[PDB]
Every structure is written in C-alpha cells, then in structure tokens.
C-alpha cells in the first residue's frame, strides 16, 4: 500500500547507508564510487556534475 | 483558494552582525519571488545615515599626500566611507576632527556631540606620525535611501563649492550584504515545496532582524493600496 509510515521508515534507513554507483566501462578504480543517496521523485538517477 | 503559511523560522546569529534565517515551507516558486523582492528593496531602498563629503584643511585634490600621514588620502576616504553614524533627530550634521600627536586617529577622537552616535568608537581612521601630527577635517553626514556613488554627485554638482571638498560614496543602506538560497523541502507528502535561507550581514547600526522586518513592512505598506 505504501503509506507515509513506509516513507518515514525508508528515510530513516537510507540516512547513513551508502550505495555504490558504477558505469559499465570501469576503466580504473574510480569507475566505482560510493555516494550517500538522497531520495528524489522521478525515475532518473541524479549524480553530482563534477565527478 | 487556501495557501500554505510557513512555520519554523529559526535564526542563528553568529557574530551579531551576521544572521542566517531559514524559512519553510513555501508554495512552489515563492522562494525566489520573496528572496528577490526582499533583496532588492532591502539593498537599494533603505533609510540610513552616512558620510557624504569630506574637507581637509590642507589639500586641494584627493590624490595629493599630506605630510606625516602614512595612509594616502584615498585610504582615509575609504576609512570614512565605512564609518557607521546613527543620528536620531537631525537630518544632516557636520562633524569635526582635530587630532594631534603620534598614534592612530580613531573614530573615538571625533567631537562627542549629542544627537550623533558612533556605533564603533574604536574604528581606525588614520595613522598619524610623530612630532608634527596635525590633522584637521570636516566630515558631513547626511540621511538618505540606498547607494549613491560619488560620480553622480560630481556630475550633478552645478553648485560649485570651494576647493578641498572631496566627495565620498554615500553608503546609506545599513545592510552590507544579503543573499538567499532556495532548496528543496517537502511537507511530509508534497515535495514541490521550498526552503529559503537568507544570509544577511549589516553594519552594526540596525540589527539584522530589524532590517528584515522593516524591509518587509515597507513593501507591504506600498502594497497597501490593493489588499482587500
């Protein structure tokens, strides 16, 4: 059903847990990096431009 | 129909002159409408008091040097530009500096008058050397709104006044710096809402909270004609 309570629990679990982002041609060790996730609307992943 | 009014407006004043203000949650898009309205009115149209003109008894042009003052006339002009004066009743007053001897001529050395208050008695103005150390000047303080550069007065100064009358940029608005950041903030289910971070540094005379408050007051008062 996914009511507000589920979103609060998800927010609390996600807080300090980091996730790994990878791009199919991992040329060097920086092809895999870990980031702290921020929940957002939409179906697209937003990554910081500089990296 | 029915709008959303913001709650939880916390203000952490690090360094009494520096105040950060957080404001949420606001309907979509109003972050920038209020940030900009506030900034523009606050910065450009704010009643204040400031030094406008200066007279040195000794020199005819602002690029010459006076004997025994290490700082050039430019430096003393800039030191006077920053000087924060708050007058209660009178609109324009003429302050005099007469100092002698070795050491730093500071704002404290101004003649202590009734209606004029110097918020920083220890603000450095000039450094005077030894054994000659003669400094005399007349600084004019006037009240006005906003920022007026010297170049427009010198342009429109058809009333020619005698030599030595060195114009300085009049910084009336007591707000030295202001900016607003808009950031994503969601009210438990609506994500299309925003947070306003207002960082403001003023120059002592007015406390930041009062600056914000009177700015918004005057804007609303202008708006007064239409609000039903």
């Amino acid at each position: 059903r996914e009511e507000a309570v589920v979103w609060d629990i998800l927010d609390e679990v996600i807080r300090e847990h980091p996730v790994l982002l990878n791009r199919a041609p991992t040329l060097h060790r920086l092809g895999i990096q870990a980031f702290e996730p921020v929940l957002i609307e939409g179906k697209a992943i937003q990554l910081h431009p500089l990296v | 129909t029915e709008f959303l009014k913001p709650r939880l407006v916390d203000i952490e004043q690090v360094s009494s002159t520096h105040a950060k203000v957080t404001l949420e949650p606001l309907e979509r898009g109003f972050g920038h409408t209020l940030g900009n309205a506030l900034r523009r009115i606050l910065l450009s149209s704010m009643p204040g008091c400031a030094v406008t003109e200066v007279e040195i008894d000794g020199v005819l042009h602002e690029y010459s040097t006076k004997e025994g003052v290490q700082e050039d006339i430019l430096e003393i002009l800039l030191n006077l530009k920053g000087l924060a004066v708050r007058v209660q009743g009178k609109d324009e007053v003429i302050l005099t500096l007469n100092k002698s001897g070795i050491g730093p001529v500071t704002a404290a050395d101004i003649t202590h008058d009734g209606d004029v208050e110097i918020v920083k008695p220890q603000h450095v103005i000039c450094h005077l050397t030894d054994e000659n150390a003669s400094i005399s000047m007349r600084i004019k303080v006037q009240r006005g709104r906003g920022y007026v550069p010297a170049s427009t007065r010198i342009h429109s100064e058809e009333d020619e006044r005698p030599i030595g009358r060195l114009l300085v940029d009049a910084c009336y608005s007591p707000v030295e710096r202001i900016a607003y950041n808009v950031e994503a903030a969601r009210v438990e289910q609506r994500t299309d809402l925003d947070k306003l971070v207002i960082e403001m540094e003023t120059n002592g005379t007015i406390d930041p909270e009062e600056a914000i408050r009177r700015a918004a007051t005057i804007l609303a008062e202008q708006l007064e004609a239409f609000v039903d």
Binding site: - | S44, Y147, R177
Partner: protein, 50 residues
C-alpha cells in the same frame, strides 16, 4: 566545461564599463555594487582585500 565558461566570463577584464576607477572598501561591497546595477560585473577597479 560550463563552470569554466562562467568563471572566465566573471573574471575577465574590459577596457571600459560602468564604475571605472571606483574604490571599494571590500569584496562584499563589490558584490553589492554589481547586484544593484551601478557597475558592470567586470570593470577595472581598486579594492581593499585582506
């Protein structure tokens, strides 16, 4: 790329603009001047910096 363009534009100098030869008491005042439209974002100027 975009960043570098922005910074290049921001820092670049121009022969003549608004506020040629003004003396500003500090960077915050510089920013106040630019945001009020009393000076172009790039124009040669004398500034006090610590």
């Amino acid at each position: 790329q975009d960043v570098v363009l922005g910074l290049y534009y921001m820092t670049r100098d121009c022969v003549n603009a608004k506020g040629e030869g003004m003396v500003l008491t500090g960077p915050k005042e510089a920013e106040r001047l630019y945001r009020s439209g009393l000076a172009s974002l790039h124009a040669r100027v004398k500034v006090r910096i610590t």
